[PDB]
Amino acid sequence: QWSGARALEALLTVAGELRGPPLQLDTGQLLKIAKRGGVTAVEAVHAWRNALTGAPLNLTPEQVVAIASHDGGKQALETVQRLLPVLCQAHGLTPQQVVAIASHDGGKQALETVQRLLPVLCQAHGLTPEQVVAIASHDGGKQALETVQALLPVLCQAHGLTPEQVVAIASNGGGKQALETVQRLLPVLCQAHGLTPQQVVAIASNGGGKQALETVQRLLPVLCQAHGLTPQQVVAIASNGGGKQALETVQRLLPVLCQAHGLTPQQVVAIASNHGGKQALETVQRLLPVLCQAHGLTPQQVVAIASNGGGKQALETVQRLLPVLCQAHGLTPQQVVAIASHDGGKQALETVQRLLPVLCQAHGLTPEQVVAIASNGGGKQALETVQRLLPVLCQAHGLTPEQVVAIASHDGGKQALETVQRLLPVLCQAHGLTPQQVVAIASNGGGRPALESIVAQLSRPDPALAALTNDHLVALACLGGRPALDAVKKLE
């Protein structure tokens, strides 16, 4: 008999009881835990199904699932019950910060290291606890913290980094490796290749930090001479997420793409400078002629789709869905491209296919309005939030469909929609803001934190924003969102 038979059965046993109180998990939560945390993690969640759910700790099931669904999730769950009170009272962290720290593989290691090192890091190394929390909140968090403690002085003094840079480098998976590689390679990359420490920090400030710095060091010569590329264009490929894989794939496919399809180097750099760049490039070489065949898409439209993170998923979903979206849903190829040319194009595309008839028939939007909402990063999220929240923003808060679509139609629209639904009453009813002023504030990228900052002022007034009327705060909030507000906060 296949070994896994027993454990698998154990899994289904324990996981049927978890559909019971007090977590009520929905199959797609039990799977998640099962896949990443394993059976020990499903069986830890059961064994601690009460201790975690209410007084003392009081975690949402969402928050229990987040802690459990990683390797060592059992250890994390045990450690969180032990240290969360210790960390909120002895160190002053929110429990949401403790959950953040715990929700990665080896979470236990992270938690115990924050417990052990946060004093020495804040006192003797000058870090804020929020910096310590960010460093901690990735896989290998424990490693990154011990490495920060050890290398912060040598990185700042011998190498000229600001502690902020050291923290930005540290705050990724493999933070330890990136830090160590930045130490070793910073002088080599600066003194031999004329890179600013700033550019070295940007290369290092990703996952595959170590990998990207070493691949830049090895390949900058081969790329800038025998491949007509600038130091700037190599830095950009290496620091935008593509890292090692993207740089090596730029070597391979730069001539193939150009020579066979007439793409400039700038178009190749842009396709490269993203997460999964290598994937986008390879998919572009593979799929371009299929798309552009028989007066299909123009090349430039392929370059566009491809030049966002997830470009490969976007290219393949267009290939698959262009026909049905145009035939069955009355969309132009131009529209399909626009939806696709954003991070998560694939998600937006699939969500338009699913939700366009619903949003038109049941909610009275136009296809154009649907395309507009879908045509931003996180399109899937904005579109699903529009469906959830349209009848509520309209009926309960008096907003027009037009106004909702407008809040919806930026990056973060989901966040902006959910914040408007929650903050409109206190803003209007308690502080005299008009619905239109509220809709205006939220109708930008960063609508959410801009609404929250406006509320932070009219709820617990900083004396530094006092000479500003509501109408002035509103104008500032529209113009530069939270950062503009915090900008004036620094004036008193």
Partner DNA sequence: TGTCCCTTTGTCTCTCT
Partner DNA sequence: AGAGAGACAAAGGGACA
Q: Among residue numbers 119 through 138, which ones bind DNA (CB under 7 A)?
A: 134, 137
Site for DNA in 34-63 (CB under 7 A): 35-41
Residue 288 amino acid letter: L
What tokens appear for 81 in the block? 């019950």
Find out whether 451 and 422 touch, Cβ atoms under 8 Å. Answer: no
Site for DNA in 255-284 (CB under 7 A): 273-280
Q: How far is the CB of 7 from DNA (least distance, A)?
A: 7
**Residue 72 near DNA by CB under 7 A:** yes
In the bound state with DNA, the residue whose beta carbon lies nearer, of 38 and 197, is 38
**Residue 397 near DNA by CB under 7 A:** no
**Residue 168 near DNA by CB under 7 A:** yes
**Residue 117 near DNA by CB under 7 A:** no
**x/- contact string, 198-237, with DNA (CB under 7 A)?**
----x--xxxxxxxx-----------------------x-
Site for DNA in 75-114 (CB under 7 A): 75-76, 100, 103, 105-110
Binder of DNA out of 118, 136, 141, 322 (CB under 7 A):
141
What is d(CA 336, CA 340) in angstroms, rounded to the nearest whole number? 6
**x/- contact string, 416-435, with DNA (CB under 7 A)?**
x-------------------
What tokens appear for 281 in the block? 């490039």
Residue 329 CB-density burial (10 A; 0-12 exposed, 13-18 middle, 19+ buried)? middle
In the bound state with DNA, the residue whose beta carbon lies nearer, of 87 and 204, is 204
Site for DNA in 430-459 (CB under 7 A): 444-450
In the bound state with DNA, the residue whose beta carbon lies nearer, of 40 and 81, is 40
| Helix-, strand-, coil-residue percentages of the chain, each rounded to 5 | 70, 0, 30
**Residue 29 near DNA by CB under 7 A:** no
What is d(CA 345, CA 336) in angstroms, rounded to the nearest whole number? 10
Binder of DNA out of 242, 284, 303, 365 (CB under 7 A):
242
Q: How far is the CB of 50 from DNA (least distance, A)?
A: 20
What is d(CA 379, CA 112) in angstroms, rounded to the nearest whole number? 38
Residue whose pair of structure tokens reads 């206190």 in the numeric block = 426
In the bound state with DNA, the residue whose beta carbon lies nearer, of 91 and 105, is 105
49: which residues sit within 8 A by CB, 6+ positions away? 18, 22, 23
**x/- contact string, 335-374, with DNA (CB under 7 A)?**
--------xxxxxx--------------------------
What is d(CA 73, CA 288) in angstroms, rounded to the nearest whole number? 43
Binder of DNA out of 15, 84, 121, 143 (CB under 7 A):
143
Site for DNA in 288-327 (CB under 7 A): 309-314
**Residue 415 near DNA by CB under 7 A:** yes
| Helix ranges restricted to H, 157-298 | 163-170, 175-187, 193, 197-204, 209-224, 231-239, 243-261, 265-272, 277-292
**Residue 197 near DNA by CB under 7 A:** no
What is d(CA 256, CA 289) in angstroms, rounded to the nearest whole number? 13
Find out whether 148 and 167 touch, Cβ atoms under 8 Å. Answer: yes
Residue whose pair of structure tokens reads 């933070």 in the numeric block = 175
What is d(CA 183, CA 213) in angstroms, rounded to the nearest whole number? 11
Find out whether 315 and 280 touch, Cβ atoms under 8 Å. Answer: yes
Part of the chain binding DNA (CB under 7 A), chosen from 50-58, 86-94, 222-230, 482-490: 482-490
In the bound state with DNA, the residue whose beta carbon lies nearer, of 327 and 450, is 450
What is d(CA 127, CA 221) in angstroms, rounded to the nearest whole number? 37
In the bound state with DNA, the residue whose beta carbon lies nearer, of 344 and 397, is 344
